[model samples]
Target: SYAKKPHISALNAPQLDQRYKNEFTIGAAVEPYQLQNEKDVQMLKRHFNSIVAENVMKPISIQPEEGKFNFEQADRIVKFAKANGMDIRFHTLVWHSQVPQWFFLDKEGKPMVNETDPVKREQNKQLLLKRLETHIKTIVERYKDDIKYWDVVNEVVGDDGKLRNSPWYQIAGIDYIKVAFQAARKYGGDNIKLYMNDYNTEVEPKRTALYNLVKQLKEEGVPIDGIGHQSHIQIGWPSEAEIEKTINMFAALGLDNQITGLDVSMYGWPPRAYPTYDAIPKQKFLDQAARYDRLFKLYEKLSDKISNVTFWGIADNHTWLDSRADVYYDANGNVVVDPNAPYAKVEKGKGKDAPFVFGPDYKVKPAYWAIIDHK
Candidate 1:
């Protein structure tokens, strides 16, 4: 009976695209290095129906300096996704992070303005607005036809639900949100689904803040079509009831609900937990699988409101958490869980054996089956 069942590998498995069909799209974030590996590429094509470039498409990576653009890395990903019949989600048209220092500087490369001075303050506002318009128009216009959706804005609201005090907010104010969405709609056209993405939105006061923000944007007639919950969740942080409640809250506002990033990290693990998958016991893996199953079941129930679910990564080997460099070992090579060990500053994920559906050897873990077997 087992032999009779069709084998599922990177080459021949029914892609998530076919399985979901007209339902929501399933996707993963891809890094350039993973694509260079044959197994990674094959797994990507075989499993995922949509792709987001993990970093190559970001503001700094795409346009590092003013008036200059580099599409080499991004183009490679687009080509690969297209060849494999995958839809593309253009990430983050506007964000405070990952931008060039020049963006907020003057001709002499100084701070753009003296906020204490009214004249320079007004002048800097105009300068920043002009740059924002150009950045959004150029990138969206270039890929409008190919990109199915866009994360037009990201992480503007903080834990308190107030606007994060970044350079963009200080200079341009809340109008920046409206302006970015307007530019995306103008250039990307109506067919492109635009989303405002943020993390940890499954609970309040961020949840309340997001609800109020979406409501206001709707009242102002912004072109935002959806709200993306970056569910970089861990075990037992937000109960299932809380997450379900949050989804309903947004859906009630008539916004398309999307999970832009879904994965468990070292959340809730006891201090000194194993850093790699090989070291984690089977029970822990099964628990992760259960979480995946529970979350997807909820998604399935809200299929009418939710449009897509994009896992933050394709495999455990390349997660951004690995770069946190959290793992420590003693002289004998046993993992040491030192609470006082300094974690490297946050950077792009070069994750260790954090929970991923696919393992380092390209084998499907129980987490993979949870999704595959979901009705």
Candidate 2:
């Protein structure tokens, strides 16, 4: 059900780090298993100059319990980065996703949100703020000397120009964001850049809401030094004009811009799933190449405004998108369709989201060459 593998060496293309040496930092995300692969490590060091932990640096991985720190996984990734001469962008210190369940539960083990009782609301808020402080400070201090970038707070703003309804927002309002940033600054190194990172900043009221949040916070000296665009785009959507507009709009904030999590998906919005490469025409791959070409061309043109451009993952063989394991089989042994879109043939599977610059064999697909294009 997966796309046909290109099955060749990625070295056929020019070294990505060398190609973008003058433009911006070239980066790719990696899991520890991939790092153990000899061939993968060689190709990564040859092309990518920066790395972000695919999961190990997040709160769940670093501190699964309150005051219970686990740095073994993170330490290995850091050591690998140092040994390979690559810069490290700690994937996140604070985020709404992948966070431990203990964070939002009150003393009574109930979900902490919308505590209409005035006194309980204050109690919950303070409890959460203290928890947030401890979590951020512990991770930042541990890696202060080694890591240069931190995604301090992620996805705080929802898509409708309002704060996301995450329990953090519900209990503490916007104070948690400020507290996370301040603690990160207090504990991070001299040159560490704290980023306000999120997905879909190119769409909707999210862009405006983010700008307003960052502007107000920055004016108050909240210590945010950059904006992270989680550019999880698609094969044929969100025109170049839309992207350029997002970049220019954020430029008004006068903060550093980084393409944090960039991977052009094989499918567009509404989350369609396919079992074969039919809808995924061979032309679809080239179309992805064209889209990447346009984005890189823009990244090249606005290189001065952007600091780092990192793909979401290394290759089609392993993407966060492929981790979708929501099994929905019908009584007839057919796949269950998305109830949101009953008419479409979309179903559940692993091979549907082959959305990286390389195929399963780690060969450079057209999308890989897309970024290599120059004047």
Candidate 3:
């Protein structure tokens, strides 16, 4: 039978209800700082089939200070994974974000420690390469047997479809991503697969741009392993045909592809307007439930091509669904974006009744039952 699995990266203990273990292929995203965290790590192992270290394995965390190594947190995290019988995924080896300040600049703060002239970007490149080699070598060597996958580089491009303007790119130049991957191979990170991860790459010219980039990377023997699509969509799910095409695009490179972050938040008026987020109207609950069902069906259909499918959070409350930047909220009790239930004027919670997939108490919501009942 095909699998109907979804994962959560940043969940707390209370989020791991029975159904999570019983019916879903559960996984938790963790950070190095949280691994030695007894409460969170214990809860994560109880519910997840896989454990992904969020930022610890990234180049920055491993090399926080130029050529300096810090494995204290990462060591405990890997130990926890091994003890729990959990599959471990190195969250990232290279990422444009969450990087240390030292990777690109000099002591004088003039930028590019290794370079004085403009084209001496080459010198900066060498410095980054040296750090990458040492950092990846130390960490991957320490846990090579325990870790099998890694996000080689993450979110290198912007929503504008342009390469990110981070110092990794500015100082090391655009080829820095490839260098990171190659360095991973040179270091003990070689045996494990590597991936490129990004969000909103499912939309528009941006998606096409990522697809082409992966192809070129593969051709160049870049040691690129896979592509991770953070499909944080709501309302209309991407068609199976579209997803299949995406799966095939990466498959052509003989690399894995993952739906890295999954969440469906079109329940009712945005959550912030409600005094409590769970106050969404009942019909809105059904709508969100149906959306989860639709996306899971697609996930099952493409299980062959996908290595994993993950949710951004454990439950609605933990998700970014209620963030002000992502959605608008009005303190004056106004609501927006309710499609199922109409109101004279839309206010928060306009269509929300029971918005959570699992109730606040962690009981199975209709959406949970829907997946169980899915044929």
In Å, residue 194's CA in model 3 sits off its true spot by: 0.7
Which pairs clash inside model 3? Answer: 9-29, 280-352, 280-353, 281-352, 281-353, 282-353, 334-347, 334-348, 335-347, 335-348
Candidate 3 lDDT by residue in tens digits, 1-375:
112433223243234323434333555566566565554555565545667655566666777776577777777777877887766777677776777777666536656744658656676678667766666667767777778777767888766777777777777765778877887776654577777888776665677778877778878888887888776665455564676677776677687777666666553223324435554565655666676676667666666667666555444434445543122334554553434434444333233223335454444555665554445
List where candidate 3 sits over 4 angstroms from the true fold.
1-25, 31-46, 55-61, 113-116, 237-241, 267-275, 320-357
Residue-level error in angstroms, candidate 2, position 18 = 1.0
True-structure Cα RMSD, model 1: 3.8
lDDT of 3: 0.62
Let me know the TM-score candidate 1 reaches against the reference structure: 0.89
lDDT of 1 by residue, 1-375 (tens): 011233244355446556665668888998777889988888787778888988888889888999998888888888888888888998778888987777788555668644667787788878887888899999888898899889999999988779887888887788889989999999888999989899989867899998998899989999888899888787667788898899899989888988888778654433345655566776777778778778777788888888888888887767765655345556556555555654443222222546576666666666666766644
Off by over 4 Å in 2: 1-8, 276-279, 324-346
| Candidate 2 lDDT | 0.81
Model 1 regions lying over 4 Å from their true place: 1-14, 269-273, 328-351
TM-score of 2: 0.90
- Report the candidate with higher TM-score, 2 versus 3: 2
